[PDB]
Design a protein around this ligand. Structure first.
Ligand SMILES: Cc1cc2nc3c(=O)[nH]c(=O)nc-3n(C[C@H](O)[C@H](O)[C@H](O)COP(=O)(O)OP(=O)(O)OC[C@H]3O[C@@H](n4cnc5c(N)ncnc54)[C@H](O)[C@@H]3O)c2cc1C
Ligand SMILES: Cc1cc2nc3c(=O)[nH]c(=O)nc-3n(C[C@H](O)[C@H](O)[C@H](O)COP(=O)(O)OP(=O)(O)OC[C@H]3O[C@@H](n4cnc5c(N)ncnc54)[C@H](O)[C@@H]3O)c2cc1C
Lengths: 649, 649
């Protein structure tokens, strides 16, 4: 049988890095088991434009995230806050994990989140040397082309930031403490210097920029290739076609097309793993030292539960025979991101509006991301951290995209046909999303694509027969996402109001207004904010604050109407994590509480979602697990000029 | 280990009956493999009202169809005809298959379908005995609490039938060929004899009645029970707690909590079956004579495909190792039913309207169904069989229910809240629904909840650069479902128009006007149908017709607006089948083409969907397969008085 010291389950954004840098620096046998197989010769994945449906048959025009042959299909239970919808969120299958099917963006997360929201031993100064290693291994690139809309938006944001600085409010969405009174907005001159948002020292927390960073590499021919975990750490230089290492890496052995279900125990120690190959044959893998599980946010708690780690009552209810430890917290507290969307129309003569929206197409260099800014807390938002007036946090990730990002049903309902050529998309992402859920298994026989996922986004609050004063804190806690989404809409509105004058100044004779969010409603919401200030959100429950005045009814009706759009006119991001975070299931050394020699090293073990995209954080967790297992800080001391070599075929 | 003579996979609506009567009438060892366990002591399933959520926890309020512990979650690929959404359809998991979580509505299917759409040897005179056996074994009951608007609707239908008969059209939705010139509308007299829609001779193909037949049995205590296949054929009288037969059924052996993946062949003949138990240990079962697969419409083709039966090219591409027989037709031609929904509002004084909609609440005997008729083709339907001038066909199933059956999003959008006490629902279910699809697997490792399911219903038509004279037939073939939906709306409108006068005559002083589908649009549709006759549907493509008058533009606009409602304001029925039909995957004796000793005996092996619900048809397939396997007409000649004995506990 197969025998080895360390067994890694799941070759995702962290498993590949862990296996690579663990086989390099040691001499013990390593086995990596992955559900899928390699895709180095598949044009759909390697080409960056294969993400947008470039090599798909006419009768099967679906993306990789909706394809069962590329990803798992984690259907969730009905959403009580979104009219009982059941969105599908996917995890990749094969070498590279979910990074094989993603947008290839890279955001670091910032300094404030790690300093304030993560436990001791995982502060920014302890993880920046691994962020640097991950970034230098991926080696992303910036945008090459540049449109005139970016400069106009940057100038409008600069004017807004100057106004906010002069106003003197302690907290705003365009203030940064580490810079001072100078707005942190890129210059619009042709010879300007870019403002990197992934700075080593984390100076840029609320920064307006001109470009993102995409994980692509230009090839000697002239085309681009997708740079992800699979071809970076598990390419032909290190792993051959038999799943064996070459040279120094001869210790590592990779098994392909192997789905695992259980971990065998001798009471407190893992002693084996069982999996099934392509012929339906059950195989058993001996474990000598340790087991590391990196199956992702959705499927790590399930494999933990069906092995006998969780609530004993429910596990005996469903029918688990072998039980090991009692953690009623396994699989609880799952976090994610959300992104409401906005559409804008441009008015004027066809020639000027055609010159205005030019040079904003999509190429493997930008992936449709013009990129505007990372924003802070709106001054009217009541739910802020305790020291939000001292250190600046990240809440919004502003983005700009061509075309219209809207489900076809809303496209028909609103009348904004994508065939039009005078519309563009602004998105105010939320990277501090409040709702939390949990995961439980349904049947204790085999891995299944659909466990029980509960995740309610925009719920409503029901009044009770109590004085309003003590009820208000409950309503404030319950209605956070709605307030955040509406304040993001207001942010976009102010940006458009400033950008009208900015564009008129820059030499474009055009005008702009919102169209999808029913500009009348946005204008009324802005007026209501301006006239009500801090207590504006009390109108979400008009019964307890009844004005008996036409203005009050008007504001309540407008707030009720605007609550409809974030439920349907938006989409969920596939940035789920924190389901098995540190402090609930594992300690600071990534060891499962109650056992001896098993560890979790994926995004599920994250204490708090990073302030942005989540590719780099999982790789950082894996890199830290490397020298936690080894015991010596090899990666933290590895020279920067040492990077893995790339083999294409 | 385990050895036997016949191995049955899946104890569904057909496997239960087949195993029961095959163990009764023979002397050979029989093994039944099921992926679930008995629910005889679970109030959610045994109580008929548990379907609506009578015993659900407040924080897990989900129906049995949406619960992963009760059913398989069959997610499908985006539907290009309904704005690209992915509805979820389930098969029940446990003793009784999908009959354990269904609405318990029993419809035989009709006679014309089995006389014009099934091969020789499967005509109505060869299946009526098995239909009678299934019906007497289940022993349904009729509704006990008769309402008042049922009589009003029946009188309106009688008036419409009189008008249609006096007119002289060859075909319409209230003409029955096997009844003469007398309308087939049930009497409204106090002592009226019931009209049975499941009659032995099949004379009622277009019949208007007052109550359906549902599978519930009244206990001596007073409360009702759910009488499905699981407790009918697999109760404690016959199968013990371990899973062994009792007395005469000593040859049976039932294995619970067993999921199968493979069928082991020896070149052309099955020799074994593999399954995984609750503990997670792979087991092997020997086969001596026969293997029968009854895993359902979705999951029987998957089992066949990953076993080595199907398109060799795709199977080899996805990694299937062993290939047995090449047949690219496996998993093709999937059919299902679609039910648009209509909402009506009643006007009048509160007392009269309150007493008008009385005695229509849902109780365990009618389950919210009052039932109207099995209607026929509309006179203006262009896509109808040529045989329709001699025989009558079932196309529309008409049902009524209190409250509003609408997704919450459309409930909010249309302004029709469920709190109103003056609304009721009319549903015209399409039972000759045209579109078809196919099923493919993604990974050759283990059974999965989500394989590739393609099903596109409301696809539109794009004109080409050709003369209209040859373009018209293709457009006529493509646009059938929209035509059927609009004609159903017109049928409901006519029924309401007649019901207004009938109610005003019967004593009530009220007015009924349809609301949800935007009455003005329906009025315009009715006027346009009357004006344009047979060629009304030509205006789905206003460019190709060449009409430019304001009337033509208005009619085209109305036809465009109305097409929005069927896509979203409806829900797909779980009556899927015909994916391994007779003559394409199996012969007339249910043996799989190209193989030696395996058969399929479920709803997937049906040649054409019946005119109504599909439980009885699946049970009939199983019952017929019983005596085909045995070779003697045991069940056809069994006396009607010999029925199984119920054993609740
Ligand atoms: C469509 C999409 C777009 C995204 N875009 C971005 C983006 O722009 N920026 C960003 O930062 N992040 C993005 N992400 C998220 C990013 O891809 C992941 O967060 C990241 O890969 C984290 O990796 P992980 O190891 O934690 O999880 P995964 O990469 O999902 O790890 C799962 C791995 O484990 C394997 N596995 C799972 N279950 C089993 C099992 N039972 N047995 C064996 N193996 C198993 C899988 O085959 C896979 O190899 C996107 C994700 C998706 C789905
Ligand atoms: C919500 C709902 C309501 C319905 N209402 C009605 C109604 O009112 N009237 C009506 O006539 N019909 C109704 N139906 C449909 C009806 O219940 C089914 O069509 C009928 O049971 C068909 O029987 P079958 O054996 O073909 O499918 P099923 O009974 O669903 O057969 C599936 C069986 O196979 C087993 N199985 C599947 N895969 C495997 C595997 N890999 N290994 C082992 N076992 C496996 C399952 O555990 C299950 O026992 C409804 C269905 C649903 C979902």
């Amino acid at each position: 049988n197969l025998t080895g010291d360390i067994v890694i389950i799941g070759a995702g954004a962290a498993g590949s890095l862990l296996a690579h840098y663990l086989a390099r620096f040691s001499n013990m046998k390593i086995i990596l088991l992955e559900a899928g197989h390699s895709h180095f010769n598949d044009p759909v994945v390697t080409d960056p434009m294969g993400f947008f449906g470039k090599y798909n048959p006419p009768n099967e025009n679906i993306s990789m995230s909706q394809n069962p042959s590329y990803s798992w299909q984690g259907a969730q239970e009905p959403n009580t806050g979104a009219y009982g919808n059941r969105p599908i969120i996917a995890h990749g299958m094969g070498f590279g994990g979910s990074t094989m099917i993603n947008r290839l963006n890279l955001v670091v997360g910032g300094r404030t989140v790690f300093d304030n929201d993560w436990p001791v031993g995982w502060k920014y100064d302890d993880v920046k040397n691994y962020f640097r290693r991950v970034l230098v291994d991926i080696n992303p690139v910036r945008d090459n082309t540049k449109a005139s809309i970016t400069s106009v938006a940057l100038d409008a944001l600069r004017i807004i930031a100057e106004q906010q600085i002069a106003s003197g409010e302690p907290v705003d969405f365009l203030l940064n403490k580490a810079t001072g009174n100078v707005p942190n907005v890129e210059k619009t001159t042709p010879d300007a210097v870019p403002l990197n948002l992934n700075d080593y020292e984390g100076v840029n927390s609320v920064v307006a920029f001109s470009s993102f960073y995409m994980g692509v590499n230009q090839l000697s021919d002239g085309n681009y290739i997708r740079k992800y975990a699979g071809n970076t750490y598990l390419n032909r230089n290190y792993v051959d076609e038999n799943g064996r290492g070459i040279g120094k890496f001869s210790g590592l052995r990779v098994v392909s097309d192997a789905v695992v279900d259980r971990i065998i125990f001798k009471g407190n120690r893992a002693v084996g793993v069982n999996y099934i190959d392509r012929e339906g044959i059950m195989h058993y893998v001996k474990v000598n030292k340790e087991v590391v599980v990196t199956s992702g946010a959705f499927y790590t708690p399930t494999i933990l539960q069906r092995s006998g780690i969780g609530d004993f009552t429910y596990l005996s209810s469903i029918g688990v025979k072998n039980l090991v430890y009692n953690n009623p917290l396994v699989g609880t507290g799952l976090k994610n991101h959300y992104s409401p969307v906005t559409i804008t129309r441009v008015h004027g003569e066809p020639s000027e509006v055609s010159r205005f929206l030019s040079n904003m197409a999509a190429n493997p260099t930008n992936m449709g991301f013009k990129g505007l800014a990372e924003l802070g807390f709106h001054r009217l938002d009541p739910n802020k951290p305790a020291n939000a007036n001292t250190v600046t946090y990240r809440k919004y990730q502003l983005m700009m995209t061509a075309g219209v990002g809207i489900p076809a049903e809303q496209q028909y309902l609103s009348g904004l046909s994508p065939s039009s050529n005078n519309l563009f998309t602004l998105i105010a992402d939320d990277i501090r999303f409040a709702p939390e859920g949990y995961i439980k298994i349904g049947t204790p026989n085999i891995p299944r694509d659909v466990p029980k996922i509960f995740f309610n986004t925009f719920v409503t609050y029901t009044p009770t027969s109590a004085p309003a004063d003590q009820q208000w804190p409950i309503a404030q806690k319950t209605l956070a996402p709605l307030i955040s989404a509406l304040l993001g809409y207001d942010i976009i509105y102010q940006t458009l109001i400033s950008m009208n004058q900015t564009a008129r100044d820059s030499g474009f004779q055009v005008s702009l207004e919102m169209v999808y969010p029913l500009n009348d409603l946005i204008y009324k919401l802005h007026n209501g904010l301006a006239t009500y200030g801090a207590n504006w959100w009390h109108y979400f429950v008009p019964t307890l604050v009844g004005d008996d005045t036409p203005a009050g009814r008007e504001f309540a009706d407008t707030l009720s109407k605007l609550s409809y759009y974030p439920r349907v006119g938006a989409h969920l991001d596939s940035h789920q994590g924190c389901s098995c975070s540190i402090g609930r299931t594992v300690d600071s050394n990534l060891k499962v509480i109650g056992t001896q020699n098993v560890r979790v090293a994926d995004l599920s073990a994250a204490a708090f979602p990073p302030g942005g995209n989540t590719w780099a954080t999982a790789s950082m967790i894996g890199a830290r697990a490397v020298d936690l297992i080894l015991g010596f800080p090899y990666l933290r001391d590895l020279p920067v000029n040492d990077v893995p070599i790339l083999n294409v075929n």
